[PDB]
Amino acid sequence: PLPLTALSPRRFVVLLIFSLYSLVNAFQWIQYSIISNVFEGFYGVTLLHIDWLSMVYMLAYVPLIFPATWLLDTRGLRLTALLGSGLNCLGAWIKCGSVQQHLFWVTMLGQCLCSVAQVFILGLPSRIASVWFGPKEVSTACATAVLGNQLGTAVGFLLPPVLVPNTQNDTNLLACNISTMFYGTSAVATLLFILTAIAFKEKPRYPPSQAQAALQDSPPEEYSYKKSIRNLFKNIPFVLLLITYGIMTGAFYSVSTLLNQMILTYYEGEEVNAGRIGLTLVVAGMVGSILCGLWLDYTKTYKQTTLIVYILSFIGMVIFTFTLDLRYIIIVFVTGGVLGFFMTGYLPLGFEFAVEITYPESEGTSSGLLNASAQIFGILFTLAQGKLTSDYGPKAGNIFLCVWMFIGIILTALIKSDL
Ligand SMILES: CC(C)CCC[C@@H](C)[C@H]1CC[C@H]2[C@@H]3CC=C4C[C@@H](OC(=O)CCC(=O)O)CC[C@]4(C)[C@H]3CC[C@]12C
Ligand SMILES: CC(C)CCC[C@@H](C)[C@H]1CC[C@H]2[C@@H]3CC=C4C[C@@H](OC(=O)CCC(=O)O)CC[C@]4(C)[C@H]3CC[C@]12C
Ligand SMILES: CC(C)CCC[C@@H](C)[C@H]1CC[C@H]2[C@@H]3CC=C4C[C@@H](OC(=O)CCC(=O)O)CC[C@]4(C)[C@H]3CC[C@]12C
């Protein structure tokens, strides 16, 4: 073992920049939904338009995930990072010019650009950790990278409600507030893109790890994504895990998208409290993910922990469903915290379970399949729950999510694995 491995400080920068601009991307995913009523009033559109603003992120991932993976594998890390940062910045700039009562389509175009950016952004963490960090720091680097996107989602929940008060009567003030938010986002994105261009190197001068040294020394042989996908689908346990992970992530996405509508249904003039509830959910989910990772480190068992977390998530969802309409915000906070805790704690455990089931196949293809299933389930759940809430109230959509979570529990139980 003589790879001449060395560790460079640049790796930290490579992480930071990424964890920054990825964060910004997340902030742009949920900025509209959290104050969806305000934008609906401003643009004179329906809630479905604001829901589609969030759902374009999910729609763009499925068709572009695998071509993006091929581009990353061939061209390298720097091109992917530049594409993601530049697309995010361009989307923010386009949104900056969409502040008018009749310019919704401009904001939709900007959101589509950010959606295309997300495709490059999402899969970067593991590659960055492997390329730039040593064996003892890969897991921590990847965890920090994903927590960056989670924190971006939390900030997207918290900030827009405060930045833009619901001053429907005064259109000029509302336009000024929207312009301020968009310009701030655009400035941050531009700065992050400039930093990525200046400092985001392709790879360190020397390999960080012996495994990375071997990977760089010998180019990978030609591989087919379609063959790997076909082989993965033949594995029934992996298909079941895909379905359950997609169901859980789609439920989380639907809850995030429609949280403002559900809270506004029973609480009037509480957009700031809705943003606080969303941030509490996201932070509790981050804590649950960290605790679940440590728990899995302590005990290697995957099936039992995954099933327990799924059942706890279902219980929390039921409690939130039957406590939303109690007309007390504190119970909403507590229920959202518990639900987010369990929901987000499930995801890393499911991902590790997936990689364990599909060890022979590449991690990238399984990651892409899991993310695509998550996006598809998110779109379906968002549409169904939004229609139910508009027609029969939030309780109908929440019960729909509860039933889907129960189905996910049953599917998780059926999984067969010796891990
Ligand atoms: C480049 C990638 C990211 C794909 C981008 C696709 C979008 C440009 C499309 C996909 C789905 C479309 C949406 C599908 C359904 C609707 C509902 C539709 O509502 C109505 O026509 C009825 C409104 C009323 O009730 O008065 C308005 C357009 C909208 C938001 C569409 C807007 C354009 C969207 C977002
Ligand atoms: C479990 C449910 C909820 C989700 C199921 C989703 C999959 C069935 C979809 C999601 C994205 C799809 C992929 C999107 C794009 C492509 C690229 C496409 O490329 C080619 O035609 C050439 C492939 C090659 O280079 O070998 C082949 C199909 C494939 C892999 C698709 C196969 C089917 C996939 C994996
Ligand atoms: C795996 C997938 C395909 C399962 C799909 C199940 C749906 C068909 C279920 C799940 C939740 C159900 C909803 C749960 C609650 C309600 C509220 C209910 O309200 C009423 O008007 C009657 C009760 C009351 O008076 O409050 C009307 C039916 C509805 C929308 C239900 C309609 C049927 C839904 C969408």
Swiss-Prot record:
Phenotypic consequence of residue 347 to P: Decreased choline and ethanolamine transmembrane transporter activity
Effect listed in the UniProt record for changing residue 32 to N: In RETSNS; uncertain significance; decreased choline transmembrane transporter activity; decreased ethanolamine transmembrane transporter activity
Effect of residue 125 to S: In RETSNS; uncertain significance
Consequence of substituting residue 55 to V: No effect on choline transmembrane transporter activity. No effect on ethanolamine transmembrane transporter activity
Annotated keywords: Cell membrane, Disease variant, Epilepsy, Erythrocyte maturation, Glycoprotein, Intellectual disability, Membrane, Mitochondrion, Neurodegeneration, Neuropathy, Phosphoprotein, Receptor, Retinitis pigmentosa, Transmembrane, Transmembrane helix, Transport
Chain segments annotated as transmembrane: 4-28, 47-74, 77-96, 104-132, 138-163, 170-199, 236-266, 271-299, 302-324, 328-357, 366-391, 394-416
Effect caused by changing residue 253 to A: Reduced transport of choline and ethanolamine
Listed result of changing residue 232 to P: In NEDMISH; uncertain significance
Glycan-bearing residues: 169
Effect of residue 118 to A: Reduced transport of choline and nearly abolished transport of ethanolamine
Residue numbers on the Cytoplasmic membrane side: 75-76, 133-137, 200-235, 300-301, 358-365
Disease tied to this protein: Retinopathy-sensory neuropathy syndrome: An autosomal recessive neurodegenerative syndrome beginning in infancy with areflexia and retinitis pigmentosa. Nyctalopia (night blindness) and peripheral visual field loss are usually evident during late childhood or teenage years, with subsequent progressive constriction of the visual fields and loss of central retinal function over time. A sensory ataxia caused by degeneration of the posterior columns of the spinal cord results in a loss of proprioceptive sensation that is clinically evident in the second decade of life and gradually progresses. Neurodevelopmental disorder with microcephaly, absent speech, and hypotonia: A severe, autosomal recessive disorder characterized by profound global developmental delay, impaired intellectual development, absent speech, microcephaly, brain malformations, epilepsy, spasticity, and premature death. Brain malformations range from mild brain volume reduction to hydranencephaly. Additional features may include cortical visual impairment, sensory neuropathy, limb and digital malformations, and macrocytic anemia.
The protein's role, per its UniProt record: Uniporter that mediates the transport of extracellular choline and ethanolamine into cells, thereby playing a key role in phospholipid biosynthesis. Choline and ethanolamine are the precursors of phosphatidylcholine and phosphatidylethanolamine, respectively, the two most abundant phospholipids. Transport is not coupled with proton transport and is exclusively driven by the choline (or ethanolamine) gradient across the plasma membrane. Also acts as a heme b transporter that mediates heme efflux from the cytoplasm to the extracellular compartment.
Protein family per UniProt: Belongs to the major facilitator superfamily. Feline leukemia virus subgroup C receptor (TC 2.A.1.28.1) family.
Protein's name in the database: Choline/ethanolamine transporter FLVCR1
Species of the source: Homo sapiens
